[PDB]
Curated annotation (Swiss-Prot), chain D:
NCBIfam families: YtoQ_fam
Protein name: Uncharacterized protein YtoQ
Pfam family, one: Nuc_deoxyri_tr3
InterPro entries, A to Z: YtoQ_family_protein
């Protein structure tokens, strides 16, 4: 069968592309989905679609109307979820998608550097797998389909 | 990936054909489903399948037997829902479909003229996206498959 | 045992007090919950908590945050739902709540005048019981506990 | 009776304000939440199952117990109040609010307007986003108000 | 710890009194609920509330609106179900309720005379316990609370 | 837009082939599933697989182990259900399958002669559509994909 | 608030009594439920209630009808579960109950000696808490109500 | 119409390839999934992905992070489950996956020697089908698709 996998995380690095390229090398039957990766497009889609809001709290809420729509639709298609944390930014959006995955019973892989273990401890304790590198998560993905 | 989208709303006007045409113009992988769009067919289907009924309430209730079957079966295929409100007709069928999507965790876009913001304020507050025109909806549909 | 019943509908008339009085007159083990029945309080609760807003759509949305929080919390306590429709106002909020109850499997009584049956036909077809008056709904409530 | 989970950082005593103000109004709400003693909460893992080979494992075994307690009390809660501050990563707070949204429990978020952007997706999914406890209390009183 | 138990079956005889009597002799913490047991009232309750119907099919459907509302509400309170089949009548309603219990994860005891084993074979195979008499179902209920 | 449909009802006669042929002629995107239609094989599959049993109850229960396995696996594939009742045989299995469909939210069509309206009143009341004939059911299936 | 806790594990010893007294000593708001603790009674209840059976397998199956009924009813009351494994007996029933609690979202504490960690690795990995002793379990229970 | 079937059981023997070969010879539309069948790979996958662990308990728990991830992901894909028990090894993981199938509504065939009926009585009572051999289980699989 084929798998759909949601990639939750901060869009500022190209961590997702790397996942997508190493997976294709191994020819795994996995299709990845996730949020809009352009940070500028993502912050402004609210005004782009529903007109320039007067204040900044309304500009973000309008953009979140659209981005939460995209996330809900793709998450509903996702068989399981991979969420990556990094040392920069609040990343409450990432914790939200990860916790959503767990709450809905979608298996979750968390990718995180060990130096962030303490603030992630409740979330990683709930995850199926916590690793520190994309390379480790790839090995977990390969093991899904291996025969020996 | 393919998506199935239920178009909820009044069948008196031909608003769904704008949505279908435009979406196909962008080649989004979206199949639309919805109610029987022929108002005279839809009102009379109960008496067409079963016979003429003793009175008007029972003519509507039999047509509803058939129409609520169609909408349940298609809505069960639907990944998300778009519901449009116009300024004519009671449209409690439209509110019932929108609120159903919400209740079942299907993402919901509402289309409604700003002039109807107050009678819809509870329902738009619960939907994922509330816009004013079909073109604004199309933009949100495209943002689902956009890379930038 | 005890039952919690959500009375959904127009807060412009006083049908709810009629249901509560006749239920207490029969001494049924039923408690009634429902929305804020003061329309001006309800329309304005958003500004009363979160301060006055830049426009009327935003003022209505903020009031809907609070009123949908009260509705959600109280619906989650309701064993079943009575929804009354009247001749005046869109009542898209009434259709919403009744549809919510159907979608969640909460038994539902609709009270509606025969003259609105056609616009309510799909929704009434889905409810457990549709009746024209409050006295009728009270007889179904009483039948719940009757022994002969 | 309503059981309400208070989610958020345990370093400060914001929960103490809500409980006191809610009791003044005589609202029929009973409050539940995590262990509020931070040192207890960080060491409960080692307290029950013994010292761990490293810090990660120390934090993991503590999460067994703390995630047990939260699951159990969350399962009793009718709805949730999550508070965010300017201090700490607060990923546990975001986890609990998201969990409430996923399970259809209504959610109030208390958060200062300065944190509006990092919280944008989360507050968008909450029922109510307010800035102060006093506003949350008004939403709560409104649950039982008649006029 | 108390339990609510729905007693589904033909109302045409008095098996439910035997169950309630023997349970109270044992002082078990169980409250029973069930359909209206006066057959003529149950048949006529549709017209009692919504007036004489145009034909017998409509008279039975209106009665079914009310009896199924009563069944849904009481069933929603019940922790588990006891369903009794006898030799008289079609009893398609009894199989409906028993099957409803199974589908909803409600433990089910079926009481049926061995004479009826073959037409009941699929249903009794899905029930937790299938016995021949009320006394056997009573011993099941006692075993729930026993200590040795 | 393919639909799997479970055909519940007595296996002694050949009503399913008429539905299957008439559907294929109209070219509807529907595949049908159902129980083993050979009555002798269906009564004996318990003893064929699990071996000769000591008595006729055990023979019927082992047959039901297998038949309820097949019904559950195919029911789980099914988008909706057609259940047909006739005048011969108990048909408690038909009531079981139809009630299961309704409990799990599968839309349901009941086909039953008007002379059986009374014993089936609760069950037809819960079904989406209750018709008298196979050709009526087909008209409802056609309506699913009709555009005008 | 009250908590109901299912105690799963072998019925050959009296480890449950240790849990019940130490929890009583501490005055925790916890009521414990569990299977019939008398093995001879537990093994023969099938024959006690239904006939003596043709063979050992049917004796065990009939006993399990009643025991799985008690388990399902009591489990349905339980907020969470404690399962204890020991060095004797197959204890597949124990693994059953623990897996069921995991699968239904019921928090689960597992007590197992370190010598059984390898054969229990999958199950303990899924549990909320794995400890070696009853005393460790009681510390987890007390942490539920502790204020410092 | 195709089915995915999880093969739960001990990964020391090759019982599974017997099921897969005979199924293929019969050309049934069934694709089988299951855990990693190589025992040494399975025990060490935790250290292989995540590094050598401080002790055997942690080596087993890291392996179980990975193995339970595989099991959750494939089980979410499975329509039904076949579990085989033999006389060797603790097989609590087999009981775990079998109970999981029951708890999630996935149909279940258990294969177990009659000599193990007593320790398996509760689990076997809840399975759809319990047989002694792979050949009997194949007769059940084939009955699923049979026309006579």
């Amino acid at each position: 069968m084929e798998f759909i996998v949601y990639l939750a995380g901060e869009i500022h690095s190209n961590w997702r592309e790397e996942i997508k390229e190493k997976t294709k090398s191994l020819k795994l039957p996995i299709t990845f989905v996730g949020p809009m990766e352009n940070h500028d497009r993502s912050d402004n889609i609210g005004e782009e679609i529903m007109g320039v809001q007067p204040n900044a709290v309304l500009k973000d809420d309008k953009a979140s109307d659209i981005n939460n729509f995209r996330t809900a639709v793709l998450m509903n298609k996702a068989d399981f979820v991979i969420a990556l944390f990094g040392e920069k930014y609040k990343q409450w959006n990432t914790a939200m998608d990860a916790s959503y995955a767990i709450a809905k019973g979608k298996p979750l892989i968390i990718i995180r550097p060990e130096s962030l273990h303490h603030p992630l401890k409740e979330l990683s304790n709930k995850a199926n797998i916590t690793v520190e590198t994309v390379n480790q998560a790839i090995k977990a993905l390969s093991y899904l389909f291996e025969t020996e």
